């Protein structure tokens, strides 16, 4: 049989919050906040500071239940987690001094092989006595896990539950025996019922109080603690309380507006509760006591992010866990503000989910794509620009133009910190003092100002040098006088300069002079004439720590040579002839991770870097990369004990090392020309840069990360595409409006489509005669859909075009068609009427955005929803409900159909390569078409008949097709053109399977790493949880090596909850479960770099490839990390 060889790695961890819980998990004394982000568990200690990050762990499972509990006899809380695949575990947090480990106290899989998973999903509850764990996994069953300390395998037992449709369930407080309280639904209505749980008989007994008949939409039960006990039950219009025979009901009008979806106890007395609803409102539910419960009261506090879950921490601080928007740390105030809100945001946490659509664009530089995502759901909806690089923390900005040089200089020998700074301008020099935070002009006498400074700094013997166009000037410090001065004999101009603590090398034309710095003396040590004119110099002392360099790096004119000379003889030790005929402008010797290199940037952006031996001067292992066009200035700075080289150019770059492979990482700035480190008393561990107009000072981060810029929209973005020629993005969005007594609709809040710079509304008469459907009622919601034209620089909404009433904008393409040279925005729509099973009407609408105005170019009525559109060889390929249709763009500028395909249930997803078309179906997974141009119609090449409920598709190459489906699995199909029969030839065999644990909405070819000059292809993908992943191809050589690595890693790495990695990654649906094939778990491979080197040795044993040591595979895995 056949097989594919793919590899998938995480570029961005999931950011949505699926659950959060509070308690005492790291110790009995301090207060923890636990966050579940689908697959990762984050532990924090609550502080007055905010949240102290303590430990983040990951699991081989989707966290479906997460609840803390304290068994009697235990000093601090234990953690119960249940996986979506039904892995159950109990966890304890142990800190062995400096090291932290979460130990698995009990574990097992609680799955019934015949079970109907419930409507409201997995529910996990623990009684107040910590005497059991209750699971509602399936209908008609209630699983029970006794919690006495023998139960190290979480052995469970089911109880037949008569009521088959349970909405929510909780254990009650203050009960004689363990008692569950649940809302359930039957043909009479929905109701509240109680049972006692007999653990020793393993059955249900009659509950404390009778059943009552609750609200039609009662959806959550709250267990009220003692002394009151009982249950609160939240519905869409009422909040009720239930106990022995006590009962109260309130129906405040405020809560009818939106469904309350989560809740949280504030105080252990149960007198106050937080309630969050689906449009972001935060309520306080107050139970009035007398003593007994007199009444219930709802009070609106303000607005948060749409909350998936809430947890009150302490001192009025509330964590808002969001999955439709950013998570928040929020403060409840006693006093309201202007607007009457008690809710004040303290801290925002980035959430990319849901990623509904995305695209890759090379906006700022060339060769390094950014992702622009459609993120968030309703008032949280936004665009997110995802850029790879290193960011600076600006702390100052002065508009001093025309800087040519910059140096950090210490002023007072008695102190350890840089507290002066000197700048070079064309022809002359200024000095500024750096007291405090803000700077002001000085001059330290002994320094010139009539000539252009080429260098200055702290030199040996408590004194300072400054080299200019006509002098080396040496200045003592404590008297601060001009204490020695050099000059070329015939007084020519100093062209090039270089210097360190003890040494000076300067050039005048083809000459070099080597001078030593001794007390009050510039001693000229030696002189030489170079073959050709001197372009650049460097004497940075490397290696064996002397302070005095035996080497001089030099770049020359007229032969593009980099030469390493020996001091003081100027002996030629090495001559590297470089490529081309433009001068080297900057040469530098440095050491990265205890290894010496020679760097030399030429004028045309190019930069070679050799291995340099600091004892023999050999230049080896020549490598070349390009870093822009403006010639590059090299300049060194260290961080903790590491060192880095900041490469000034039109594209600033930071060069460092990572496992002995050099990193070239983009800097998030415009164009930096000159740079230095500056550790001031007011700018510790900072930098200083000059952008040709301004001089900026700030802090830089250590390693490169993903950087996210957020454009709020306050609407739901749905699709995005980029128009290069009009330097803007096209974005489809919808907002929710509510019908009012006027008969029309009202938006809840301003948003992108209601605040555009210009705007239009559809003139189409295309659905006038068609039937008038069920009219909308007052107070009901409707969707208004819009094409947004968004500027690629300011991200302002330049234009908003409102579509027809009841029209959904479903798909979007930017392209040119036929002979027409205009670039158009093309939009596929559906007429969506809420009572109708499926749209039977739709439009394809051609717009163009020219000279700041959007015009409707053409229109085409179709017979259903246009889910997908792709530019196909100057033609428009579209899917209308179950047909795939190819359109031609006539010279009259109308769409005219060329051919149809009809073998679909619902053609949701389209991708193309060449004349091939990949179709993704609602239920019948994927299908391959070919356009036959000598007949002008479609040929169906092959199908996959398996019932995969597709959510996104992608063509990896002419033979391989990637699929994602609604059960969080990936698969790859292959056609076999070289098959001996038509039956074989027309069947796509699934040759790759993998459980991702995310739900994928979009694939697209692209990469967030710069690629100049192990792995083929780059497909990015976005998920509902905001996780961004990467899929790529491997040879069979690499796949077999890393598959071997994976099984070896799995025996060594401990998994939280003791979940088998092969069980986690197994392809799993309710139709079948199979082990993964054809997929390397890149996240597992990368965790190799994090294990201890003992563990690292144990994995590598008994292993050979082109033996194998621990170091060979660090070079492999480190190389693999560079794809993202």
């Amino acid at each position: 049989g056949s097989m594919s060889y793919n590899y998938v790695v995480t570029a961005q961890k999931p950011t949505a919050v699926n659950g959060c819980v509070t308690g005492h998990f790291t110790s009995a004394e301090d207060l923890n906040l636990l966050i579940a982000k689908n697959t990762r568990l984050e532990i924090y200690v609550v502080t007055a500071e905010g949240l102290r990050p303590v430990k983040e762990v990951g699991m081989y499972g989707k966290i479906a239940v997460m609840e803390l509990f304290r068994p009697k006899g235990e000093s601090k809380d234990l953690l119960f987690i249940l996986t979506a695949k039904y892995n159950a575990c109990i966890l304890e947090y142990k800190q062995s001094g400096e090291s932290i480990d979460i130990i698995t106290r009990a574990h097992g899989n609680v799955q019934d092989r015949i079970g109907r998973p419930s409507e409201t999903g997995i529910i996990g509850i623990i009684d107040p006595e910590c005497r059991m764990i209750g699971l509602r996994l399936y209908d008609g069953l209630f699983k029970v896990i006794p919690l006495d300390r023998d139960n190290k395998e979480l052995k469970a037992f089911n109880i037949r539950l008569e009521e088959l449709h349970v909405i929510d369930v909780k254990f009650l407080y203050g009960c004689q025996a363990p008692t569950i309280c649940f809302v359930y639904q039957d043909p009479q209505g929905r109701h509240v019922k109680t049972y006692e749980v007999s653990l020793r008989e393993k059955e249900f007994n009659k509950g404390p109080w009778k059943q009552e008949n609750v609200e039609a939409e009662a959806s959550m039960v709250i267990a009220v603690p003692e002394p009151f006990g009982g249950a609160i039950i939240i519905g869409q219009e009422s909040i009720t309380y239930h106990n022995g025979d006590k009962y109260l009901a309130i129906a405040p009008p405020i809560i009818k507006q939106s469904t309350i979806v989560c809740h949280n106890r504030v105080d252990p007395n149960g007198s106050r509760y937080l309630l969050g609803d689906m449009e972001g409102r935060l309520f306080m539910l107050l139970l009035e006591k007398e003593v007994t419960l007199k009444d219930l009261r709802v009070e609106l506090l303000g607005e948060t992010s749409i909350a998936e879950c809430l947890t009150y921490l302490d001192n009025g601080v509330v964590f808002v866990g969001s999955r439709l928007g950013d998570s928040q740390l929020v403060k409840l105030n006693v006093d309201s503000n202007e607007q009457g809100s008690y809710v004040v945001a303290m801290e925002t946490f980035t959430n990319l989910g849901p990623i509904v659509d995305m695209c890759v664009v090379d906006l700022e530089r060339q060769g390094q794509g950014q992702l622009v995502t459609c993120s968030g759901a309703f008032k949280e909806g936004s665009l997110r620009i995802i850029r790879n690089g290193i960011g600076i923390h600006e702390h100052a900005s002065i508009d001093l133009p025309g800087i040519k040089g910059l140096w950090p200089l210490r002023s007072d020998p008695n102190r350890e910190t840089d507290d002066t700074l000197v700048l070079s301008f064309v022809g002359q020099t200024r000095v500024l003092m750096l007291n405090g935070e803000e700077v002001e002009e000085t001059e330290l006498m002994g320094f010139v100002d009539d000539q252009q400074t080429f260098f200055c700094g702290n030199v040996a013997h408590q004194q300072l040098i400054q080299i200019t166009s006509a002098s080396v000037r040496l200045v003592s410090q404590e008297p601060k006088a001009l204490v020695s001065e050099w000059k070329e004999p015939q007084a020519k101009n100093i062209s090039v300069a270089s210097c360190n603590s003890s040494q000076v090398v300067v050039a005048v034309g083809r000459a070099l002079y080597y001078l030593q710095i001794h007390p009050q003396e510039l001693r000229q040590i030696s002189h030489t004439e170079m073959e050709h004119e001197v372009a650049c110099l460097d004497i940075t002392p490397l290696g064996d720590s002397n302070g005095l360099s035996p080497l001089c790096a030099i770049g020359l004119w007229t032969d593009i040579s980099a030469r390493i000379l020996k001091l003081p003889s100027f002996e030629l030790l090495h001559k590297e002839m470089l490529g081309g005929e433009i001068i080297p402008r900057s040469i530098l010797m440095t050491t990265f991770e205890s290894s010496h290199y020679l760097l030399c940037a030429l004028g045309d952006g190019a930069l070679f870097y050799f291995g340099l031996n600091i004892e023999t001067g050999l230049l080896s292992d020549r490598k070349k990369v390009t870093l822009g066009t403006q010639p590059t200035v090299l300049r060194t700075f260290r961080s903790l004990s590491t060192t880095n080289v900041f490469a000034c150019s039109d594209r600033p770059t930071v060069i460092y090392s990572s496992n002995h492979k050099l990193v070239f990482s983009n800097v998030n700035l415009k164009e930096v020309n000159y740079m230095c480190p500056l550790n001031s008393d007011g700018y510790p561990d900072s930098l200083a840069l000059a952008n040709n107009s301004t001089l900026t000072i700030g802090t830089i981060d250590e390693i490169q990360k993903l950087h996210i810029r957020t454009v709020p929209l306050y609407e739901s973005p749905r699709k995005i595409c980029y128009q290069e020629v009009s330097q803007c993005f096209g974005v489809l969005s919808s907002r929710i409006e509510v019908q009012d007594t006027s008969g029309g609709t009202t938006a809840l809040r301003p948003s992108a489509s209601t605040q555009a710079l210009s705007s239009s509304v559809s003139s189409s008469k295309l659905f006038s005669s068609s039937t008038a459907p069920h009219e909308t009622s007052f107070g009901e919601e409707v969707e208004v859909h819009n094409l947004l034209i968004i500027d690629q620089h300011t991200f302002e909404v330049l234009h908003a075009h409102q579509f027809l009433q009841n029209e959904y904008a479903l798909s979007l393409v930017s392209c040119k068609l036929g002979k027409d040279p205009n670039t158009y925005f093309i939009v596929g729509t559906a007429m969506v009427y809420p009572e109708e099973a499926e749209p039977k009407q739709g439009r394809i609408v051609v717009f163009q955005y020219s000279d700041g105005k959007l015009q409707t170019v053409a229109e085409k009525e179709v017979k259903g929803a246009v889910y997908s559109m792709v530019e196909f060889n100057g033609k428009l390929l579209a899917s209308i409900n179950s047909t795939v249709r190819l359109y031609e763009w006539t010279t009259e500028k109308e769409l005219r159909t060329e051919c149809n395909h009809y073998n679909n249930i619902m053609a949701l997803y389209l991708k193309t390569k060449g004349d091939f078309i990949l179709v993704g179906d609602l239920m019948r997974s994927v299908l391959l078409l070919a356009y036959k141009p000598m007949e002008g119609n479609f040929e169906e090449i092959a199908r996959d008949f398996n019932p995969n409920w597709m959510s996104a598709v992608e063509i990896l190459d002419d033979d391989n097709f990637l699929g994602a489906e609604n059960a969080f699995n990936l698969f790859v199909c292959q056609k076999d053109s070289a098959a001996t029969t038509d039956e074989e030839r027309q069947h796509l065999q699934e040759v790759g399977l993998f459980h991702l644990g995310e739900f994928v909405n979009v694939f697209c070819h692209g990469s967030l790493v710069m690629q100049n000059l192990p792995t083929q292809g780059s497909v990015l993908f976005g998920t509902v949880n905001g996780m961004i992943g990467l899929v790529t191809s491997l040879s069979e050589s690499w796949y077999n090596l890393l598959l071997d690595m994976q099984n070896r890693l799995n025996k060594v790495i401990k998994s939280v909850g003791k979940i088998e990695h092969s069980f986690w990654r197994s392809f799993h649906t309710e139709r079948k479960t199979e082990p993964a094939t054809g997929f390397i778990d890149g996240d597992l491979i990368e965790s190799f770099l994090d294990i201890s080197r003992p563990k690292m040795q144990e994995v590598v044993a008994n292993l050979q490839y082109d033996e194998a040591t621990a170091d060979d595979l660090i070079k492999v895995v480190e190389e693999l990390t560079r794809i993202h």
């Binding site: 809420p834 749209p839 889910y867």
Partner: protein
């Protein structure tokens, strides 16, 4: 749970019942794509249909006891076998693809078990069992029916492991067919629930029907006798559905859709139902008399065995027609 599909699809991408609405759309559509005719016959004699274990072939029994297997992709006959001396009335291959159960009309043996690895031969015969069926959980045993009696055999020894009958509780159902529950722990025969380990009758359901014996729902929670749905735990009547009256009821592989098929005495249509709440999805009217139907495990194809011509005419020409599930013909299609 928005009624319109397009609203549900959008909500899925950003804010994930809807699967029920999806099934109402999918399993209301059947477009015919292929007809299978018995080779070398002016009037086909097919009586029974089932899919191959890997469903590459359509297994078609004939009125003269033959079993003819056709390639689904090409329609060409692949193999023929001699099984009985009367019309095949039932077919059931094993999941592993190693064995097959057959049932005849009047010849003896009425039922048999056949190997399907390298040589199609009889493994064991069930001489007077007119209906025969595998155990559900592990396909290790065979359950056959003789009138009101149930017999359980072992698929390797062939020997009768036990016999279930209780003349005091029996309902003497016309079309009685004994069957296992999905766990093989229980057996329903003649409207009477049996505990297999203890060979004891657990419960006798009341008789509101004359023909239908009853089936276990694949969810393990309900028992479907004709038009009556009994809670498997409490034995209370959960629903009554008049549409299931006298219908052979099949479940799709995942147990979320229920098929049912019925002057002339036979039926012209089959109905689909949401298996989880029994609401009807669609009534698909073939213009012809139907005698068998079966689905594949992929919910891709539905094979129906249809009598060609007028309904009351009852011609002999009986073919098998393939439908593709979830698929429809548009007006623009028919040109």
């Amino acid at each position: 749970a928005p009624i319109n599909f397009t609203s549900r699809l959008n909500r899925r991408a950003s804010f994930p019942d809807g699967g029920c609405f999806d099934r109402h759309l999918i399993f209301s559509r059947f477009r015919p794509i292929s007809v299978f005719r018995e080779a070398n016959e002016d009037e086909s004699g097919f009586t029974c249909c089932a899919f191959s274990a890997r469903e590459r072939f359509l297994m078609l029994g004939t009125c003269t006891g033959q079993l003819k297997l056709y390639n689904v992709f090409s329609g060409q006959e692949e193999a023929s076998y001699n099984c009985h001396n009367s019309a095949i009335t039932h077919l059931e291959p094993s999941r592993d693809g190693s064995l097959l159960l057959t049932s005849a009309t009047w010849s003896q043996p009425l039922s048999a078990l056949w190997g399907m690895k390298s040589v199609f031969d009889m493994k064991h015969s069930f001489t007077e069992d007119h209906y025969v069926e595998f155990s559900k959980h592990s396909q290790d045993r065979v359950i056959g029916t003789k009138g009101d009696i149930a017999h359980i055999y072992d698929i390797q020894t062939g020997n009768k492991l036990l016999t279930l009958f209780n003349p005091d509780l029996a309902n003497n159902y016309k079309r009685n067919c004994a069957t296992f529950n999905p766990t093989d722990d229980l057996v329903l025969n003649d409207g009477v629930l049996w505990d297999v380990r203890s060979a004891q009758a657990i419960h006798k359901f009341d008789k509101f029907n004359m023909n239908i014996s009853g089936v276990f729902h694949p969810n393990g929670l309900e028992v479907i006798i004709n038009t009556e749905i009994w809670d498997l735990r409490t034995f209370h009547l959960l629903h009554t559905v008049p549409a299931l009256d006298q219908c052979r009821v099949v479940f799709n592989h995942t147990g979320t859709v229920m098929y049912g098929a019925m002057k002339s005495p036979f039926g012209s249509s089959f109905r689909t139902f949401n298996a989880t709440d029994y609401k009807p999805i669609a009534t698909i009217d073939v213009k012809r008399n139907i005698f068998d139907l079966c689905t594949d495990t992929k919910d891709c194809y539905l094979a129906v065995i249809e009598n060609q011509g007028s309904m009351d005419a009852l011609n002999m020409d009986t073919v098998c027609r393939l439908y593709e599930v979830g698929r429809q013909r548009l007006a623009e299609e028919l040109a």
